[PDB]
Amino acid sequence: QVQLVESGGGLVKPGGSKKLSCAASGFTFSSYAMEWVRQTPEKRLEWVAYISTGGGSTYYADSVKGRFTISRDNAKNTLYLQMTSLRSEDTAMYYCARHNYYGGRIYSMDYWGQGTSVTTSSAKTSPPSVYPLAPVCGTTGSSVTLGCLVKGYFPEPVTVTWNSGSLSSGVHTFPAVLQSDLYDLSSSVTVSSSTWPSQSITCNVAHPASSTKVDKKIEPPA
């Protein structure tokens, strides 16, 4: 398989520097021209930088001219991106992509990474408050719905899973909503009525910046 992995992202303040990297594997890295593509919260895909098969030619976008500096390391199979004078509008999900189809039509960004969050703000890095959402009754339904409130954190992202990812279908992790320099998110999970409260359920929250791996069990209030 081919794989691309972005790294070195996080929080930055406006007018600061941050260096990203894209670990490449599964192909002859030195025989391919890499791409950086960022995506906003509004989700507008925007090409930012390009570098040739071996650093012979590089292009940029009007947005990121002069401030951004793309580079690569063919010995270590490692792409790079240096950022210099970051603004609020540079806050984005930074993807790394290859650029090679070569025959019938011509080149194309055929393989992409998993992205990495870069945020530009002078606000405080705050960890999440995980509160369990159990319902007010133990009444009978076809299926029972529970939840997990990821309250007051900054910045994005936060990873929410149920029972270490074993519970997946019938789950709804909602988009975060920023208010007063603080994000709030709340995932929900639906399960059969005979399962809970007889069997245990636990939402697993993880906030990279604070390094807070939390696991809050959902119990009824009697």
Partner: protein, 202 residues
């Protein structure tokens, strides 16, 4: 400039769907990408997808559309590409109207012993996206102190969801006992309602 034909488009499963990408410069080819809900964009152009374009105007064709194809699509250019992307088209899918499953939750002990008190009301799996919700407390419609968040088209269910969270302090939670979550939708003119009363602890 590279421009899309529809900003947003809808089409039911089975039926055909077409969207075009028009540049301001002639090219020998055109590319297409599909980014789904949480995942990254995938290089695209199964037997559903195919490309058709003459000179400048290109277009993506999707016959026998399915729930999976509910995604946002981006076009980039062929021969003469400083590798800019297009405006983007959001393709949602038509579906029979589904009534939302309402579920209200009191604030936990952990939150109550830290000053705050948040009351969540989940409205999962409905159609269309449109949904009005008025938080009530002792029969009084609350306007502010509410932070909503909607999900986008489900990749297999093709249904939207929502989570409305009323946020108050432990002190202001005592003035009023009966907290209520009402919800309006196309399916029933009579609105969906779930409520609970404090001073009645479990």
């Amino acid at each position: 400039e590279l421009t899309q034909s529809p900003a947003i488009m809808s089409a039911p499963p089975g039926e055909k769907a077409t969207m075009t990408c028009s540049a301001s410069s002639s090219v020998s080819e055109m590319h297409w990408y599909q980014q789904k809900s949480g995942t990254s964009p995938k290089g695209l152009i199964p037997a559903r997808f195919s490309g058709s374009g003459s000179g400048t105007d290109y277009s993506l064709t999707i016959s026998s559309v399915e729930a999976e194809d509910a995604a946002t699509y981006y076009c980039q250019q062929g021969s003469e590409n400083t590798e800019t992307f297009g405006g983007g088209t959001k393709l949602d899918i038509k579906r029979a109207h589904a009534a939302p499953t309402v579920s209200i939750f009191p604030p936990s002990s952990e939150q109550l012993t830290s000053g705050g008190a948040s009351v969540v009301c989940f409205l999962n799996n409905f159609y269309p996206k449109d949904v009005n919700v008025k938080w009530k407390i002792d029969g009084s419609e609350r306007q502010n102190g509410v932070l909503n968040s909607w999900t986008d088209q489900d990749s297999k269910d093709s249904t939207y969801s929502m989570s409305s969270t009323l946020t108050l302090t432990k002190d202001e939670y005592e003035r009023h006992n009966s907290s209520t979550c009402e919800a309006t939708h196309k399916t029933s003119t009579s609105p969906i309602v779930s409520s609970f009363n404090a001073r009645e602890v479990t």
